[PDB]
């Protein structure tokens, strides 16, 4: 499972024994790993309490924004730099804060595809 | 182990505001969520059985509620788990009887009888204010009810003011303000079932609400919190208050 819970070690260091099983409310979910493709492929996910959330597994277009506040829907050519990891830019992975190359030029992603389901960025 | 929401409530754990014998039986009516909190309400079923003696057995009480012979705030209610809370008006037209729910000096609720003409007015504390789309102002009361009004009328109201609500048709009658010298009836605390006048409002930062000081009829001064202070008149109580 993906369990987002207690560290097995105390702050001082004494290893912590578990006293109960894990809880479904406490587990997480797989990583989206949003990628560059020719079309937008998305998965809606039922979530805790019946909510919903859509998840981009492949992205084709982006909403870039001018500093003035005017938005352009455009395509995404390739990712320039991913500060989150070095493996991601090599594998066209799309993540918030990444520097991306579109037809307009250089943009910085200011949205999370994993949770938002769309990719917004600011022209630089 | 427990795995979610309860549906029961043992008699022994019942709130201290209910004049209910506790070791006679074990099971009581768990109130469903509603206008007033667990700590300031009781199921209507106990009102019918104990506080009015109209029903000896809960089944018969439920039958009478099914007949819909009871008017709370000018609305019939069949739910025998309704939280009938503080400063509500219970009206029986078949008997022409009208009471208001009010705590005790000890911290328990009693049905103080009131005149029929008063039975249509309900004062509501203004718990909070909010802006809803369309720039409309929505006010959330102490009892959980909500009232919508215009942007222009926003300053007519402020939190901690009392609105004399016309419950039969939901019409706003008067807005008693919170300012120095108002007449205020306490709701909770050691000073419960006290009525006095305000001299000072203690502006308390660091997470602690406003402590108002109340001056009683005899001139004795005491203190309580803002939220426990419920205004009922500028200089005299506009409702019969024991």
């Amino acid at each position: 499972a993906i369990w987002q819970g207690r560290s097995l070690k105390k702050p001082s260091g004494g290893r912590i024994v578990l006293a109960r099983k894990k809880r479904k409310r406490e587990l997480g979910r797989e990583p989206s790993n949003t990628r560059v493709a020719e079309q937008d492929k998305r998965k809606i996910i039922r979530t805790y309490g019946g909510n919903r959330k859509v998840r981009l597994t492949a992205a084709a277009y982006a909403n870039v924004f001018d500093k003035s506040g005017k938005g352009r829907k455009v395509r995404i050519i390739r990712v320039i730099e991913n500060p989150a990891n070095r493996q991601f830019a090599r594998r066209n992975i799309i993540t918030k804060g990444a520097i991306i190359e579109t037809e307009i030029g250089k943009a910085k992603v200011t949205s999370r595809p994993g949770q938002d389901g769309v990719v917004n960025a600011i022209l630089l | 182990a427990r795995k979610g929401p309860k549906r029961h409530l043992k008699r022994l754990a019942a709130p201290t505001s209910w004049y209910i014998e506790r070791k006679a039986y074990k099971w009581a009516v768990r109130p469903r969520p509603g206008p007033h909190n667990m700590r300031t309400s009781i199921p209507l079923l106990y009102i019918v059985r104990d506080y009015l003696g109209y029903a000896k057995t809960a089944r018969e009480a439920r039958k009478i509620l099914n007949e819909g012979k009871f008017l709370v705030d000018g609305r019939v209610r069949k739910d025998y788990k309704f939280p009938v809370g503080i400063m509500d008006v219970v009206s029986i037209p078949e008997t022409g009887e009208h009471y208001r729910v009010l705590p005790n000096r000890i911290g328990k609720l009693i049905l103080h009888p009131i005149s029929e003409d008063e039975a249509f007015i309900k004062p509501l504390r203004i718990r909070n204010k909010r802006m809803i789309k369309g720039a409309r102002v929505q006010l959330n009361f102490h009892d959980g009810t909500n009232h919508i009004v215009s942007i222009a009328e926003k300053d007519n109201y402020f939190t901690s003011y009392t609105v004399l609500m016309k419950v039969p048709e939901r019409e706003i009658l008067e807005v008693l303000p919170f300012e120095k010298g108002a007449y205020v009836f306490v709701t909770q605390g050691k000073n419960v079932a006290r009525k006095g006048r305000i001299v000072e409002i203690k502006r308390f930062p660091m997470g602690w609400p406003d402590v108002v000081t109340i001056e009683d009829e005899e001139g004795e001064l005491f203190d309580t919190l803002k939220e426990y202070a419920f205004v009922v008149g500028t200089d005299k109580p506009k409702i019969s208050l024991p």
Partner: protein
Amino acid sequence: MRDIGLRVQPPAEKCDDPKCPWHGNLKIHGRVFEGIVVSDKPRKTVTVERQYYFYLNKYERYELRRSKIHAHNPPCINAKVGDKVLIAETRPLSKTKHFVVVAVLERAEE
């Protein structure tokens, strides 16, 4: 100058962090304590110490205890050891960081 709701002047420096209560998105709600800085080595971190006297019901004397607390040190104030500081409960921030410095009542040299 933005208000924290605690009677203390604001730090002169304006930092760009998202974790300065005077210069960020985070809030404050919970108790306020006071204490002394004992260690500052980890980045943007502080361990505040607090001494107090505790009463032994069987012995009717007093036990002086020392209590430590981890908290976050924003760069605007830059707390150092030897300094009397004010601490407030804050949003969970790290594995253990759950309090934040709000001011330096008195630095070490004084």
